[PDB]
Amino acid sequence: DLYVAGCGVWLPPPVTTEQALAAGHCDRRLASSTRMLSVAVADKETPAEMAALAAQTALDRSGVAPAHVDLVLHASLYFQGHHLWAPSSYVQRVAVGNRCPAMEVRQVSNGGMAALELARAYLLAAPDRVAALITTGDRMHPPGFDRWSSDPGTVYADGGTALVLSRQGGFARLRSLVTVSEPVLEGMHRGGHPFGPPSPEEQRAVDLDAHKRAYVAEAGSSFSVARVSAGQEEALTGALEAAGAGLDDISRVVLPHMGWRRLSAAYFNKWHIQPERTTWEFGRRTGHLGGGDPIAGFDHLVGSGRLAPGELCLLVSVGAGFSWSCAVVELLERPSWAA
Amino acid sequence: GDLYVAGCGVWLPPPVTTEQALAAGHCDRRLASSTRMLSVAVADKETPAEMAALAAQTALDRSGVAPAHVDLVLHASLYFQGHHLWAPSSYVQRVAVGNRCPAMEVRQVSNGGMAALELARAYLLAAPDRVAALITTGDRMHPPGFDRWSSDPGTVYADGGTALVLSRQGGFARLRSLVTVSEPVLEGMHRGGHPFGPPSPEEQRAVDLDAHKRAYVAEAGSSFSVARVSAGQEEALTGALEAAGAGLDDISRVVLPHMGWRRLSAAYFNKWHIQPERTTWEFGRRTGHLGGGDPIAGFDHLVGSGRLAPGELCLLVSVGAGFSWSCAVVELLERPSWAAA
Numbered sequence A: 001d002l003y004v005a006g007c008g009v010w011l012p013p014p015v016t017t018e019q020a021l022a023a024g025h026c027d028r029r030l031a032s033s034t035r036m037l038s039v040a041v042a043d044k045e046t047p048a049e050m051a052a053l054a055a056q057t058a059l060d061r062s063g064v065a066p067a068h069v070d071l072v073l074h075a076s077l078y079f080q081g082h083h084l085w086a087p088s089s090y091v092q093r094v095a096v097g098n099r100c101p102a103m104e105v106r107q108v109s110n111g112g113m114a115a116l117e118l119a120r121a122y123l124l125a126a127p128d129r130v131a132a133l134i135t136t137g138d139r140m141h142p143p144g145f146d147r148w149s150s151d152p153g154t155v156y157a158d159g160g161t162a163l164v165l166s167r168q169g170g171f172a173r174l175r176s177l178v179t180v181s182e183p184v185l186e187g188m189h190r191g192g193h194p195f196g197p198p199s200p201e202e203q204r205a206v207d208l209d210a211h212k213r214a215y216v217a218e219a220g221s222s223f224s225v226a227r228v229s230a231g232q233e234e235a236l237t238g239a240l241e242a243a244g245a246g247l248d249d250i251s252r253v254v255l256p257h258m259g260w261r262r263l264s265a266a267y268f269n270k271w272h273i274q275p276e277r278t279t280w281e282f283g284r285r286t287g288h289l290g291g292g293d294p295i296a297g298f299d300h301l302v303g304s305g306r307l308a309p310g311e312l313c314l315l316v317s318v319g320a321g322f323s324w325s326c327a328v329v330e331l332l333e334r335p336s337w338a339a
Numbered sequence B: 001g002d003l004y005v006a007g008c009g010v011w012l013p014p015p016v017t018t019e020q021a022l023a024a025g026h027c028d029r030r031l032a033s034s035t036r037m038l039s040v041a042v043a044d045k046e047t048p049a050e051m052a053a054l055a056a057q058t059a060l061d062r063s064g065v066a067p068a069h070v071d072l073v074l075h076a077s078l079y080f081q082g083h084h085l086w087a088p089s090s091y092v093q094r095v096a097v098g099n100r101c102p103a104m105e106v107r108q109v110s111n112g113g114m115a116a117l118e119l120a121r122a123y124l125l126a127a128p129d130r131v132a133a134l135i136t137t138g139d140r141m142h143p144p145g146f147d148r149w150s151s152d153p154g155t156v157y158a159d160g161g162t163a164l165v166l167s168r169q170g171g172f173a174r175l176r177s178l179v180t181v182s183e184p185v186l187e188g189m190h191r192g193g194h195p196f197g198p199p200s201p202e203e204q205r206a207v208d209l210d211a212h213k214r215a216y217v218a219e220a221g222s223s224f225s226v227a228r229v230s231a232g233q234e235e236a237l238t239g240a241l242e243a244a245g246a247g248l249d250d251i252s253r254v255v256l257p258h259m260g261w262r263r264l265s266a267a268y269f270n271k272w273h274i275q276p277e278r279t280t281w282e283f284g285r286r287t288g289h290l291g292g293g294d295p296i297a298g299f300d301h302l303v304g305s306g307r308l309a310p311g312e313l314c315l316l317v318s319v320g321a322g323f324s325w326s327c328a329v330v331e332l333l334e335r336p337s338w339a340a341a
Ligand SMILES: CCC(=O)NCCNC(=O)CCNC(=O)[C@H](O)C(C)(C)COP(=O)(O)O
Pocket: A077, A107, A108, A109, A110, A151, A153, A188, A212, A224, A225, A228, A262, A266, A290, A318, A319, A320, B085
């Protein structure tokens, strides 16, 4: 199989829900239903800057030489700051210093696990390949984005994450990785008829709620909820089965950093697992890093010593489209940078 | 090189002539002359993923490959896809494939099609039972954010979609080589901020790549910039030729980016001493730059117009800001039924 050789995050200072309420960015009803405590917010740091910083951390920990990094993939879900510019080449220039292929991979909030899929294949496609770097980075600022209200129920963070995947060795083994696609749901996140062509553009601003309501009215709530539930179930069961494990075999579940209401509907009141078995407390203080959530969550569990050698971790990620990815990761040893 | 091209296609909206552009004040006479563009495909109502999906329907139908045999869908683009936090690749998959393999975006600015081809090749090769992959491109380069004539003087940007179906099973052409080169020292040329510092957080509402280029060159040096670009292009060319066991003289047709005449002459005609008549120059100058899509559209043109004969070799040439370069040698095995004589 493949190994996680390194990982890291770069998170700008948090803004608390209390500060957000006082600043008017946020209403009480939303604070209450999401149960968020705080979210990382950048000042001047741009998406690729934060990704390269996380990447520098992940690479240092991995100890992998630049020449053994055979691919760089940068994932993100929002504007990277400069049109017709190569943010992955920035990540490569600053964090890696080598000349392998560097490109972007996007799959909305599932982008990190999507990049992991392509990185796994790339490493397996040739016998001499060693490692791949995956990064994520996003800066969810005005004018085009409202971290509290553009997609109500999820509060968006600024920051970067990174993971080093390796065929040679590492502190954890990737026991399975399964990705599920249900493209009938793609219209849920755009204008135009759900089952026809998209409408004309909308750069500022992001308003996901209206598009969802329109989708549901056309396809029906029954259809929408059932297709979403089914896709999530396929990813879970596929990943667990591929790893020879059941959900009871899992010590910690890395969930997306969504608000409480969404996490309860999707996971807690569905799978009947307890919050303490998940990254809920970490996520509710961090915010949604898009495709980066499973990397940030795994890094936190490992870094804080909350995952022990021999224990299995389940990564859970979902993106508009829809796409789902689940992965089972086995911790082999506590890395030197952990507690 | 045991991969095949099984299908390809394009969907191009109606052309706007340079004459129309000149009359509209979108183009000046100096630019028209220097680029020698005749026309550019321009979309009216069509959006990027819509055009990509149309090209994919064409590519898939031509390939005869079953949707179930499509194991990966990659959609490449260089500009805003029309909706944020929305998945254009899933639109492409819903409309053109109707299957449930992974579907995602790959970007590498104007090298995005070949970058997707690199990842698709690896994906197909990574498990013994995988069959085909679909790569698409699509962009719509409209005002106010973009000026297709002036945002990047020297290249005129097109709206349109392209698609290619790659297969391990079989197809009408064989992928003999594909090589990608990366020179990330050049990344600053296409953004604000210091070339060797962090990107500026100040967004440039109207894209002006010429301003960014001038700032980069003033800092990194003109000589350094030209040479590093030249070298990257040379590495990709020679690498792809060597990997295919071929020399430039063995290549019957060259698919070049749809840049303006001045750029093509500097980068290719006066450098490689190859004939414009041996390239897709005439097709490109009527189509415009489709970003990562050029090599697909150019290859599609050559095959569909019957200009490539069985046994003959084709060189695909692609470059993107970053910079990244990709070249590929494709061998035509048979004239596909959808082609002309
Ligand atoms: C950045 C956008 C993105 O990719 N988000 C990940 C996908 N979005 C979600 O998973 C949010 C949860 N939404 C759903 O499960 C379905 O769409 C529902 C259940 C039909 C509506 O959800 P709701 O808005 O009520 O929370």
